[PDB]
Amino acid sequence: VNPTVFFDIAVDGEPLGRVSFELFADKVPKTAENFRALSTGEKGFGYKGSCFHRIIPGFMCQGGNFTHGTGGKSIYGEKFEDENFILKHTGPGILSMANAGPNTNGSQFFICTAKTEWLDGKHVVFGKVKEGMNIVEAMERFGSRNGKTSKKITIADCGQL
Amino acid sequence: PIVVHQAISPRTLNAWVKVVEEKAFSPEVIPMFSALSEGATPQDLNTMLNTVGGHQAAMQMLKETINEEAAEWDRTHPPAMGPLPPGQIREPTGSDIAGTTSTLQEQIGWMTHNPPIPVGEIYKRWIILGLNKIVRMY
Numbered sequence: 609v610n611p612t613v614f615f616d617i618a619v620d621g622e623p624l625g626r627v628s629f630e631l632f633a634d635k636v637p638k639t640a641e642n643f644r645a646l647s648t649g650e651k652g653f654g655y656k657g658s659c660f661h662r663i664i665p666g667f668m669c670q671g672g673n674f675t676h677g678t679g680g681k682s683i684y685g686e687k688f689e690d691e692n693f694i695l696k697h698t699g700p701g702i703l704s705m706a707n708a709g710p711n712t713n714g715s716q717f718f719i720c721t722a723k724t725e726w727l728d729g730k731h732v733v734f735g736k737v738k739e740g741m742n743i744v745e746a747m748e749r750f751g752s753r754n755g756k757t758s759k760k761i762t763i764a765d766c767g768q769l
Numbered sequence: 770p771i772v773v774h775q776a777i778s779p780r781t782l783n784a785w786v787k788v789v790e791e792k793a794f795s796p797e798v799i800p801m802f803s804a805l806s807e808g809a810t811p812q813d814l815n816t817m818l819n820t821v822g823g824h825q826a827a828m829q830m831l832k833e834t835i836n837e838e839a840a841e842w843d844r845t846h847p848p849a850m851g852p853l854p855p856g857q858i859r860e861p862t863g864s865d866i867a868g869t870t871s872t873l874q875e876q877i878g879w880m881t882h883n884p885p886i887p888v889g890e891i892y893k894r895w896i897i898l899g900l901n902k903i904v905r906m907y
Contacts, residue, residue: 664854678850708848716850727852753854 609634611768613647615655617743618764619750627719627740628769629703632733636691638684639705639713639734645683646672646715647766653681655715660761662718663751669744670706670718670755671763678708680715688713690732697724701737701744719744770808771880771889774873777813781805782820789821799900803893810876811868811892818896827907834899835892839863842891866892 610633617624633640646654658674673679682688689711697704697720704727706716719737721744737744750757770777788794788801806814821828842863849860861879865871866888879886 662850667854668852670850670852678847704852706850706852708850718852724852724855726855731852755854 611640611644612738613644613768614766615647615763616765617660617747618762620759621762621764623764624746624761625740625743627743628738629735630738631703631735632695635694636732636734638688639691639732642683642688642713642715643703643717643734644768646674648768649766651683655763655766658763660747660757660763662755663748663757663761664753664755665748665751666722667724668718668720668722669747669751670716671761672706672714672716674715682714686714687711691734693729693732695733697727697731697733699723701741702733703735703737705732705734707731721745721748770813771810771877772808774810774877777809777816782817785817786821789824795904798904799897802897802900806889806893809889809893810873810880811866811871811888812873812876814889814892814896815868824907827903830903830906831896831899834902835867835895838895838898839867839869842866861886861888867895868892 611631612628613631614626614628616626631640631644645651648654649656653674655672655674658671660669660671661673662670675681690713700721702720704718704720705713706718707713713732747761750759750761784801785805788798806817818828818831840863846860848862853859858875858878861871865875868876876888879888
């Protein structure tokens, strides 16, 4: 039921490591499916070659703006509704939707690097890191309190396992 | 006013109510408003405006101007992508600046941010534009 996808991460074009994710299709099928299809590129656009544009050490790593600042698009149109808030931001590894307010999901997502309970009920949790959390932890060091990254952190490849 | 929040003075409200009611002061309504709202939070501004009895049509007309300015703010200030970092609140929406959807504590947070997000001064600008219409008409 639950698909698994991978990112191969690169730092300034140099391979860093693979991160895999379990997507919670069983609980948030619509949200899982958007991220799954964007990972395979099967609609003809997606995460491959996009960057982690906002990394805040001790909080989260954010990416998925593959259109350029609010950018990106879902597989259903530009934005979609918050599916549910059943699942919580319980710790590092949690994969959750970025948004600009209620019912504004597109393509942007984030990986928690800590327990972030104040996001519960505001961001839709739809997966978690399976393998490669130490890569996510390494990626944190390229961030700033600002979110500005010190290097180009990119998704060199991605797909479904 | 921020000075820590401090309640607006009783007779700041006095000045104001007594400047609204009397026609001879009509040209000084706007300047008086400016002078009486120094360092005002949006909550302070709403308290001041809403203390005035017997001018309901004017006050409804002002609110329409305010609501227009709030929507124009939103048009030119799309919300930032979250998630919000710990300890950080949202950039203010138009209704937040007008004090309708924000709390005093959020207003204080914005106004004392480094650098300041001057929600009192912004709202004051909207009110002054509305007061211009009502000075002209009522």
